[PDB]
C-alpha cells in the first residue's frame, strides 16, 4: 500500500482533545476542545481560530443546568450560518457564531433519553446523521461504549425529528455520507473505532437506512482506530486512524486502504477541507494541535456550500 509524506504545517496548538474542525459560510475556522476541565468537571469549549495568526478565541462554553459539555464534532448549516455540534454530554447543540447556543433534544422520537454524541454529517437533503458513542446525556452519569456495545446512530430530519436509526455499536465515531453524481444521498459510512471497522448502509430516505455491511478495514493492531472522516471531490474517503500515525485513503468502493498518508504525529483525530481548495486541516491528540497539508485534489462540497435556490 503506497504511503505519501506531504508537508504538514502547524496552525495552532494547546487545544485539549482538539476535534471537530469546521469552516462556516463566511470562511471562518472553528474547532472544539472536548477535554478542557475545571475542578475535575467537563468544561469543553468551542473556538474560532484566526488562520493568519493562529490566535484562539473561545466563543462558547456549553453548559446546561450546571452540567458542562464535551463538544466533539461539528457541521455548518446551509440556510443559516450556525453550527450543529455533537456533544458527548449534552447531545446535539446548535451554536450561533456570537456564542449563544441551544439544546436540540433531550429525548428522541420514541421518547427515550438522548445519548451523548461525537460527530455528525449532513446529506445534501439537509438531514443530519449523528454518531452517539456515549451513554445518556447529563444529568445521567457519563459513560462510553468503548468496551460495551451500546453506541447508537441518529438522524435529525429536516422536519425536526430525532430518530435513532440503529444501535449496538462499540463506539461509533466518524461518519460521512456518500452522494451520487446527481446529488442524491446513496450510502452512510460509520466508523466503529476499537473494532477497526468501517460500516455502510444504503440510504433509502430520511432516517431510512438498510443493508448494514462491513465496508472497510482499518490497518493496525494499535489501540484506537478510525476517528474522523471526509470525502474528496472524487469520492475517496480520508479517514484519521487514531494511534497509527496515518490517515487512510479508501476508494469509493471501500475494502482495504488504497493509499496512506503518514503524519508527523501518532494521533490524528479529525479533519476538514478548506472550501474550494486542496488544503486539509487536521486535529491530533499527541500535541493537541491543528495542522494543515495539501491533498491531491479538492474536497467534496459540504452541505453548507450547496445552494437552496440553485438552477443546476
Ligand atoms: Ca471523533
Ligand atoms: Ca470534517
Curated annotation (Swiss-Prot):
GO MF term set: calcium ion binding; diisopropyl-fluorophosphatase activity
Effect of mutating residue 270 to F: 100% decrease in activity
EC number(s) from the headed UniProt entry: 3.8.2.2
Cofactor note: Binds 2 calcium ions per subunit.
Result of altering residue 75 to Y: 6% increase in activity
Thermal dependence: Optimum temperature is 35 degrees Celsius.
Effect of residue 285 to A: 90% decrease in activity
Cofactor or coenzyme needed: Ca(2+)
Effect of residue 179 to N: 20% decrease in activity
Phenotype upon changing residue 242 to L: 62% decrease in activity
Annotated signal sequence range: none
Amino-acid positions noted as binding Ca(2+) 1 in the UniProt annotation, renumbered to this chain: 19, 118, 173, 227
Residues binding Ca(2+) 2: 230, 271-272
Effect of residue 222 to N: 14% increase in activity
Variant or mutagenesis effect after changing residue 235 to S: 4% decrease in activity
Effect of residue 171 to V: 46% decrease in activity
pH dependence statement: Optimum pH is 8.0.
UniProt-annotated catalytic positions: 285 (proton acceptor)
Result when mutating residue 119 to F: 100% decrease in activity
Subunit annotation: Monomer.
Listed name of the protein: Diisopropyl-fluorophosphatase
Amino acid at each position: 500500500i503506497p504511503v505519501i509524506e506531504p508537508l504538514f504545517t502547524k496552525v495552532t496548538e494547546d487545544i485539549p482533545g482538539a476535534e471537530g474542525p469546521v469552516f462556516d459560510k463566511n470562511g471562518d475556522f472553528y474547532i472544539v476542545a472536548p477535554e478542557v476541565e475545571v475542578n475535575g468537571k467537563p468544561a469543553g469549549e468551542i473556538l474560532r481560530i484566526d488562520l493568519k495568526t493562529g490566535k484562539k478565541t473561545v466563543i462558547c462554553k456549553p453548559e446546561v443546568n450546571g452540567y458542562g459539555g464535551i463538544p466533539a464534532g461539528c457541521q455548518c448549516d446551509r440556510d443559516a450560518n450556525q453550527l450543529f455540534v455533537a456533544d458527548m454530554r449534552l447531545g446535539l447543540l446548535v451554536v450561533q457564531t456570537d456564542g449563544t447556543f441551544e439544546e436540540i433534544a433531550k429525548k428522541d422520537s420514541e421518547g427515550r433519553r438522548m445519548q451523548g454524541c461525537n460527530d455528525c454529517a449532513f446529506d445534501y437533503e439537509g438531514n443530519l446523521w449523528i454518531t452517539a458513542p456515549a451513554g445518556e446525556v447529563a444529568p445521567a452519569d457519563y459513560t462510553r461504549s468503548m468496551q460495551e456495545k451500546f453506541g447508537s446512530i441518529y438522524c435529525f430530519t429536516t422536519d425536526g425529528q430525532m430518530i435513532q436509526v440503529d444501535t449496538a455499536f462499540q463506539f461509533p465515531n466518524g461518519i460521512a455520507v456518500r452522494h451520487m453524481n446527481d446529488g442524491r444521498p446513496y450510502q452512510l459510512i460509520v466508523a466503529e473505532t476499537p473494532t477497526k471497522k468501517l460500516w455502510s448502509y444504503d440510504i433509502k430516505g430520511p432516517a431510512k437506512i438498510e443493508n448494514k455491511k462491513v465496508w472497510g478495514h482499518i490497518p493496525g493492531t494499535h489501540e484506537g482506530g478510525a476517528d474522523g472522516m471526509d470525502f474528496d471531490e472524487d469520492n475517496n474517503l480520508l479517514v484519521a486512524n487514531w494511534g497509527s500515525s496515518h490517515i487512510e485513503v479508501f476508494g469509493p468502493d471501500g475494502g482495504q486502504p488504497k493509499m496512506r498518508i503518514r503524519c508527523p504525529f501518532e494521533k490524528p483525530s479529525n479533519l476538514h477541507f478548506k472550501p474550494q481548495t486542496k488544503t486539509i486541516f487536521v486535529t491530533e491528540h499527541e500535541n493537541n494541535a491543528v495542522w494543515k497539508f495539501e491533498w491531491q485534489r479538492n474536497g467534496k462540497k459540504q452541505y453548507c456550500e450547496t445552494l437552496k435556490f440553485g438552477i443546476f
